Design a protein around this ligand. Structure first.
Ligand SMILES: O=P(O)(O)OC[C@H]1O[C@](O)(CO)[C@@H](O)[C@@H]1O
Ligand SMILES: O=P(O)(O)OC[C@H]1O[C@](O)(CO)[C@@H](O)[C@@H]1O
Ligand SMILES: O=P(O)(O)OC[C@H]1O[C@](O)(CO)[C@@H](O)[C@@H]1O
Ligand SMILES: O=P(O)(O)OC[C@H]1O[C@](O)(CO)[C@@H](O)[C@@H]1O
Ligand SMILES: [Mg+2]
Ligand SMILES: [Mg+2]
Ligand SMILES: [Mg+2]
Ligand SMILES: [Mg+2]
Ligand SMILES: [Mg+2]
Ligand SMILES: [Mg+2]
Ligand SMILES: [Mg+2]
Ligand SMILES: [Mg+2]
Lengths: 327, 327, 327, 327
């Protein structure tokens, strides 16, 4: 049995005696992600560069990748009839779905993450988290302000050497490779579980001067292991989706701690940190800010940042025991 | 007008009043890079997973990506009738072309580079360097022991968010985007030059304990600038092709020095360091061991390794200055 | 609202307060049809012709298109958990789905129709009809012996200049174009209705010598209109799916009447005639054998043939009034 | 070895000790045919239908397939710098290349042929015929009024179940399959020859009332063979490119004679009849008006029409014999 993601979600829904909305919702995301992937890989770029004389559409229009990505997600998500509140990294306000198309899901998303890496063609991705609305009020921003602990599903699509969609739900984590030949996601790793302990550490050490004593100490340990074991390898792609995906698949740890330009860290809680934390923990990993569990923070700003440290349970706890020691 | 690599290469050939072997070799490489790209993006992977039954080999009998890539490159290059000796990272010995397919060119390639990043879907790529044969005598592995300085052409294909072929010839570096919808590389940047000074450093800091004192000092400057300027950001994909390309386009520096565990460095002179060193110098940047230009090393072994430091000229110059100050 | 076929079927199922099986079933067919289309358009054919030296799979294997098509459908259909009996044109016996994977639907199909046209690259297609099982007995052949009047859904995918999936159900007929860039079928014509009267007639007139008086007379009329109107244009592609699709879209009429090599006509009732008749009639057209309604014939052999005349209501009735006149 | 059209064309050029303009023109055509093929198969059609919002023009402002095709062909051909005069079915007047892009070649093309079949998804295609300029004098429309006999190259791309480019040059006809996964046409049949005698006839019998007595008699022979052999099958896609290709590969005959409503026939001499006549004769078949070779007509108008009868030599010879018997 080849498992497609379309089959997988539908079977999931039929297990849960669902109304379907979530199936429709996840089918929408899949469509959006294939469309984003096709654009990310620059399909049709000959037309931008004049293969048919320009002409074509009459008056100036063209989109950056990030704008298209955002358009696809929002339109695809609305079309689902499964959502009521959308939080995109690109919209300073929560988007409230028009009643006609209103469903019960709230969706926080980064349509295209890793923007520093777009122009150099490095891996970038799409990140999403989904809540059920838990109010009877008019859907509004407040419905997106839930701790990540309430996520019913989250994951990301990585547009890398190949395109992979990682979906996490209450039961666990599954990876589906996009076969772009047939536009189908194929389950290739069922019930993914991160190694307890890794040998890779991923952080932007350019901020060394701004790190707290606890990060600084952990980093020296990765380099000069006190047990005089082999030092960890370093990897930082610079696109959270690639770096997090490699953490998931090879183990190790990823850090975006606080530093002065952000004391609250850089990464956004609702649509960067939370969905990654939910995937990590569903895979048997950890995601802490250094002081508290990421998924337990009750947000009060849909764009608030959080520091995040995530990955293998014994790497992350080793760091957390360092914070615990210094405090 | 839109410029395709096929047209470009062909005009370059016509200008030259060459015989056309170079042209045939490069159309060859293009065809191979597109065929590696489609396989890297995992097209038709659903057949591997049983979409059409025939379900026994969900394990490893079917070709790894590196073996397929190597086959594609060796085979396409042989059929161009333009080469006589080939050096692949994947074969212990130089391959000598059967006389019937013998051209005048020598090709040193890494069919898929970035192997540690293959399982996690991070960017990977293809690196080639092309020599004219110097000798009259029967072609042999010695024919490929020429300093990169003697390169007639070199470049790489990056299979990243999109696929890009970067080609550097005598008169400069050009970047061609692959539009996979029509199987055509489009000139997107012409006469590429790296910027004088970057703000990014790329090196695997996990080897901190093994770095010589100049690498050590230089890294300290990137994090704690003595003159109090902004610290450099850090980036390290873990795939030379991705980190190089990011250096070309955004500026900064890429480092893989010798370390006490690897004394002569890790990266292979003929089909990793030279081609990239050549690209870099053609783009106004530098590529050094820390003591001598990379392109000036006289290779004594086709699998010889070399330390390499490359990128913006002011950044590489600064570390060169550190090495001379350390004697 | 862009409508994908995945969304459309799911919304259909959620309207009908379904268990899902039919949604899972139609999602399976979609996947099969994209995979068939990708193969039909010869994606990967470079490998057949040695781009990477052969090698690849070790010992002889390769499939004809028709064999692959059949494999895809059967495996995809079984995987659905929605079927119990499958009738393929390629299997001399009905296929009884193993209990583990048994669903309640019976599916009759031509995985690849128009075989005379494959080697010359003309349009070919896939044809399907679906019944609910209407017995409590062990699923068996007899469950596939239902008149087409009991179909819950039928249609075809045409692999032509583009790939289109035409789905007919109790409510009517919808056309979805395959956008092979994202592997999604896009609803492009809702609730399709055939013109009452066409101006095209499609038949293999090479059998003129064997036609009954009624076909012969109608044909002379198409050529020499008794009202001295412009004669009908003639089109016969030779692949029922193309010819029928053009009948549906432009109107007119298609005939595969009885002749000596077949007195019962050539086309197979269960998986050629019936699904096409169901589409035609759902679009406001007709499908007769010349004497009786195609969809009312109770089959007794899963491979039995029927003569078929179909298309615009006034063309078909004009022919039927000719049969009525001669009898 | 695998032979790509790019390699083939390039070797053909090298052999010739040509300047390379022919080579550049044909790489040009290849690039255009792949770009028409991808658009014909409807890639990215979901953007036209609102997948990313921007929903106003679901009507006709965006480019018809024929206009896009024409733009692609004119533009790509101009940029090859190998042509001086172009004749497109879509432009009333010959197009004269601006001096800066002037080569030595004259191209007569039908960018998309098969227009009546475009809406129903039946096969369609691209037909080109390439002349050397005969004159010294400023290029003009007269430069394209040369008998097909003077053709240096001609062929067609069929966008059928798969896309195939058929190219006929002085030394014969070769068929190249497009593998759209890597954007590469693969030589699949070399030195193609049509069979002596076929069993298929292709003609639009709707004009029966307008056919001269020789066409009339010949058709009667196909259906009721005087010598009691098996009647010919009939086939008529309605797209010259598809019906021709089927004639090339399976043998038989294709007919578009003059009829009283169209006295000089329907098909255009320069960019429908000639190129196909040339292909046919290069493959050992014939192409006649019924009274003279098609390739020997001296065109007096770039949009001149001509009756054409083509295919297996014995089949065409037999109808020629009928015409001479009718005076
Ligand atoms: O350049 P920095 O500070 O290392 O930030 C990189 C981070 O920025 C982001 O693009 C912001 O989302 C993340 O993908 C990534 O991890
Ligand atoms: O794990 P490390 O030592 O940092 O290796 C990274 C290097 O490994 C390689 O894959 C070796 O070829 C390069 O692509 C890359 O630069
Ligand atoms: O060659 P003939 O007798 O005209 O038969 C053509 C018919 O054969 C089939 O391939 C048999 O399915 C149909 O697609 C088509 O209509
Ligand atoms: O409807 P008719 O007259 O049979 O026309 C068919 C001919 O029309 C054309 O489209 C005219 O270009 C050809 O492709 C085809 O052979
Ligand atoms: Mg973003
Ligand atoms: Mg982001
Ligand atoms: Mg390698
Ligand atoms: Mg390598
Ligand atoms: Mg079949
Ligand atoms: Mg059939
Ligand atoms: Mg045309
Ligand atoms: Mg035409």
């Amino acid at each position: 049995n080849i498992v497609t993601l379309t089959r997988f979600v539908m079977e999931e829904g039929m297990k849960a005696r669902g109304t379907g909305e979530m199936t429709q919702l996840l089918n929408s995301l899949c469509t959006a992600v294939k469309a984003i992937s096709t654009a990310v890989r620059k399909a049709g770029i000959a037309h931008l560069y004049g293969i048919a004389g320009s002409t074509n559409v009459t008056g100036d229009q063209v989109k950056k990748l990030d704008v298209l990505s955002n358009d696809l997600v929002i339109n695809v998500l609305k079309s689902s009839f499964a959502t009521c509140v959308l939080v995109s990294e690109e919209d300073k306000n929560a988007i409230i779905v028009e009643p006609e198309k209103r469903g019960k899901y709230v969706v926080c998303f980064d349509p295209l993450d890793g923007s520093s890496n777009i122009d150099c063609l490095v891996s970038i991705g799409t990140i999403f988290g989904i809540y059920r609305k838990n109010s009877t009020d008019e859907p509004s921003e407040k419905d997106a302000l839930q701790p990540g602990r309430n996520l019913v599903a989250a994951g990301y699509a990585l547009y890398g050497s190949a395109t992979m969609l990682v979906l996490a739900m209450v039961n666990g984590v599954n990876c589906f490779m996009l076969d772009p030949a047939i536009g189908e996601f194929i389950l290739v790793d069922r019930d993914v579980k991160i190694k307890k302990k890794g040998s890779i550490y991923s952080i932007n050490e350019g901020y060394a001067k701004e790190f707290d004593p606890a990060i600084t100490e952990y980093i020296q340990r990765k380099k000069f292991p006190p047990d005089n074991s082999a030092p960890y390898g370093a990897r930082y792609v610079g696109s959270m989706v690639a770096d997090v995906h490699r953490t998931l698949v090879y183990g190790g740890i990823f850090m975006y701690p606080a530093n002065k330009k952000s004391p609250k860290g850089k990464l956004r809680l609702l649509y960067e940190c939370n969905p990654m934390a939910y995937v990590m923990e569903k895979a048997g990993g950890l995601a802490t800010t250094g002081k508290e569990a990421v998924l337990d923070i009750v947000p009060t700003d849909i764009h608030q940042r959080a520091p995040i440290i995530l990955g293998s349970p014994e790497d992350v706890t080793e760091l957390l025991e360092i914070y615990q020691k210094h405090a």
